[PDB]
């Protein structure tokens, strides 16, 4: 509530949101990041005979838009909380605290994590195989001690669409 | 369209590229054995139709076995669905009609035809 | 080798580790025990002391 | 032929006539750097044929 | 600007911008310190007070 | 003044000082070929004039 | 090796393969002029070093 009274703010409140919910975990924010696609529906690099334009729109075939997709890392050291961030545990805590309380439709948030090696099994049935997108924690049958690694990704906190359609009426002639 | 092929060694994060690229490389080996004394603008094995709705402006295909000249196979009893019905409503003269089974062309930056968005060029698709 | 290969589902690429064969060119009058060979060309020497290539040989052909 | 030289300022927008004329102007600089290749007209540096199609009274080139 | 240039494919034409040099003539007894100079000709006033061209003048030549 | 070969990437911003710095390289290159057998600051071909305004103090160059 | 001059007309997308080839072809015209006269592998034009660090056995170039 003290943080949610300043308008249009901030980045440093996301540090408080993590240290509240599970101690031992720290947070760092990178403000801009190299986001990618949105694929533009006309390719627009046809070189035109009747009418064309220059001033801003210059590109190839896929665009890059930095502007709003921040990166967040977490860092734990108690293994009971390592199995809390994989989907099912504390991931439902952040995923609802962001989307309707603190940010809403401001931005989109990328998540990331760095632990020591993993605690992750393999190809068992219907639902809990995937450690996000990657898999590990199964092959080191060689050496005793630690190596540090990044963990995985989590999904963005986004909400969007187009609905379908074309229109039929208009505003007003003033 | 380069065809990469990865290493599996001593604990490697399972990425979606590492299975698609391996799916590609053994398609390409099938054609290189298949050239070896053949011609390859390749074609059609089986094609069986429906003649019932020809008094109307409808026409639908019932079974198709086609091998395209890029080496991709269509085996409509196994892992591919029958296409929608064609339309004859915009025809003035009836000798013109030459029906040709289409399929969109793959690029190196696109992928599945996600419904929910429009485009001027179609793609193959998760169904 | 490490490159950045695009997913074929419409997303951002990341880094994988692909393999490359360790090819090399050697000469026929060296020792060639450990390798698995196939000949590709023949070099002759020209009247001015330069190198050039015969058109007369043929490698073992899978195609004409 | 009125070979035009196009102009790129901050609002010069893209047409096919931009590039075709620009490609023509640098071909025109290939002549005026020749002060001997204008002293005789334009040359022929390799022209090689086949005579096997002459019993058929055909003809086809190899290098031109 | 608005020079009518025909695209070389068979279509209609359009209007592009074309660079033009800002050429001029000077007198070579003035001060030309921020220009480039190449001598062109020499005029002599005739005895009736009118101007005539000197038939004995050579420019810096490029072609005979 | 230095001349820069522009890097033609894909998926980036085109700016009009890529098109300029491209074409100014090609003109510089043909100057280097020209100065290999010939050794001067070159000049004028075919200056022609108009003479009807010579009763007055007026000039008309018609081809340079 | 192969060199592929691109066609400019009113359909095409803008692609980086076009600009690299049109740049690559103009070296070939600018070299086909030099073989009308001279015949050579190239040489230096200027190569000037620095005699400062040479007692410390480190060598540097000033202009090349």
Tab-separated table of C-alpha atoms in Angstrom, chain A residues 44-151:
chain	number	residue	atom	x	y	z
A	44	UNK	CA	6.509	-3.053	-47.006
A	45	UNK	CA	9.928	-3.341	-48.653
A	46	UNK	CA	8.377	-3.514	-52.071
A	47	UNK	CA	10.016	-0.653	-53.923
A	48	UNK	CA	7.092	1.349	-55.223
A	49	UNK	CA	6.478	3.116	-58.531
A	50	UNK	CA	3.241	5.122	-57.743
A	51	UNK	CA	3.649	6.182	-54.072
A	52	UNK	CA	6.101	5.256	-51.335
A	53	UNK	CA	7.517	6.770	-48.149
A	54	UNK	CA	10.848	6.948	-46.399
A	55	UNK	CA	11.170	9.013	-43.283
A	56	UNK	CA	10.969	6.522	-40.380
A	57	UNK	CA	9.986	2.992	-41.653
A	58	UNK	CA	13.288	1.373	-42.624
A	59	UNK	CA	13.910	-2.358	-42.001
A	60	UNK	CA	14.243	-5.877	-43.472
A	61	UNK	CA	11.522	-8.471	-42.714
A	62	UNK	CA	11.278	-8.799	-38.887
A	63	UNK	CA	11.285	-5.835	-36.520
A	64	UNK	CA	12.726	-5.285	-33.036
A	65	UNK	CA	10.982	-3.300	-30.289
A	66	UNK	CA	12.846	-2.806	-27.047
A	67	UNK	CA	10.473	-0.536	-25.123
A	68	UNK	CA	8.802	-2.542	-22.376
A	69	UNK	CA	9.748	-6.161	-21.750
A	70	UNK	CA	11.945	-6.165	-18.567
A	71	UNK	CA	14.120	-9.063	-17.401
A	72	UNK	CA	13.912	-10.386	-13.843
A	73	UNK	CA	16.215	-12.880	-12.165
A	74	UNK	CA	15.779	-14.676	-8.880
A	75	UNK	CA	18.423	-16.341	-6.741
A	76	UNK	CA	17.678	-18.946	-4.067
A	77	UNK	CA	19.914	-21.087	-1.875
A	78	UNK	CA	17.425	-23.279	0.057
A	79	UNK	CA	16.370	-26.318	-1.953
A	80	UNK	CA	12.874	-26.371	-0.474
A	81	UNK	CA	12.187	-23.117	-2.336
A	82	UNK	CA	13.812	-24.338	-5.561
A	83	UNK	CA	10.869	-26.697	-5.907
A	84	UNK	CA	8.575	-23.773	-5.135
A	85	UNK	CA	9.370	-21.722	-8.230
A	86	UNK	CA	8.817	-24.512	-10.747
A	87	UNK	CA	5.196	-24.246	-11.952
A	88	UNK	CA	2.670	-25.253	-9.321
A	89	UNK	CA	4.253	-23.783	-6.217
A	90	UNK	CA	5.028	-20.091	-5.773
A	91	UNK	CA	4.727	-19.312	-9.482
A	92	UNK	CA	0.983	-18.843	-9.006
A	93	UNK	CA	1.818	-16.238	-6.365
A	94	UNK	CA	3.687	-13.848	-8.666
A	95	UNK	CA	1.504	-14.539	-11.695
A	96	UNK	CA	-1.590	-13.081	-10.049
A	97	UNK	CA	0.185	-10.415	-8.008
A	98	UNK	CA	1.467	-8.772	-11.177
A	99	UNK	CA	-1.365	-8.983	-13.699
A	100	UNK	CA	-4.097	-7.142	-11.818
A	101	UNK	CA	-2.549	-5.422	-8.843
A	102	UNK	CA	0.760	-3.725	-9.502
A	103	UNK	CA	1.208	-3.584	-13.289
A	104	UNK	CA	-1.874	-4.600	-15.251
A	105	UNK	CA	-1.619	-3.604	-18.898
A	106	UNK	CA	1.464	-1.434	-18.470
A	107	UNK	CA	4.206	-3.833	-19.552
A	108	UNK	CA	5.251	-7.451	-20.083
A	109	UNK	CA	7.617	-9.196	-17.675
A	110	UNK	CA	10.229	-11.857	-18.446
A	111	UNK	CA	11.365	-14.193	-15.665
A	112	UNK	CA	14.611	-16.119	-15.238
A	113	UNK	CA	16.410	-18.013	-12.486
A	114	UNK	CA	19.931	-19.145	-11.560
A	115	UNK	CA	20.587	-22.075	-9.201
A	116	UNK	CA	23.121	-24.855	-8.762
A	117	UNK	CA	22.770	-27.689	-11.103
A	118	UNK	CA	19.051	-28.799	-10.698
A	119	UNK	CA	16.759	-31.280	-9.059
A	120	UNK	CA	15.015	-32.590	-12.175
A	121	UNK	CA	13.942	-36.055	-13.376
A	122	UNK	CA	12.800	-37.233	-16.828
A	123	UNK	CA	10.361	-38.736	-19.239
A	124	UNK	CA	7.603	-39.906	-16.832
A	125	UNK	CA	3.948	-39.473	-17.836
A	126	UNK	CA	1.205	-36.982	-18.128
A	127	UNK	CA	2.089	-33.891	-16.108
A	128	UNK	CA	5.180	-32.741	-14.478
A	129	UNK	CA	8.100	-33.324	-16.933
A	130	UNK	CA	9.120	-29.907	-18.146
A	131	UNK	CA	11.443	-27.591	-16.219
A	132	UNK	CA	10.028	-24.740	-18.233
A	133	UNK	CA	11.516	-25.083	-21.692
A	134	UNK	CA	14.826	-26.915	-20.699
A	135	UNK	CA	15.858	-30.269	-19.093
A	136	UNK	CA	18.880	-31.226	-16.938
A	137	UNK	CA	19.800	-32.607	-13.520
A	138	UNK	CA	20.136	-36.157	-14.769
A	139	UNK	CA	23.523	-36.802	-16.341
A	140	UNK	CA	26.335	-35.849	-13.986
A	141	UNK	CA	27.514	-39.250	-12.742
A	142	UNK	CA	31.078	-37.972	-12.634
A	143	UNK	CA	32.129	-35.297	-10.192
A	144	UNK	CA	31.322	-34.341	-6.589
A	145	UNK	CA	30.846	-30.587	-6.494
A	146	UNK	CA	29.204	-27.472	-7.720
A	147	UNK	CA	28.791	-25.677	-11.017
A	148	UNK	CA	26.545	-22.620	-11.295
A	149	UNK	CA	23.999	-22.423	-14.106
A	150	UNK	CA	21.023	-20.432	-15.227
A	151	UNK	CA	17.866	-22.383	-14.681
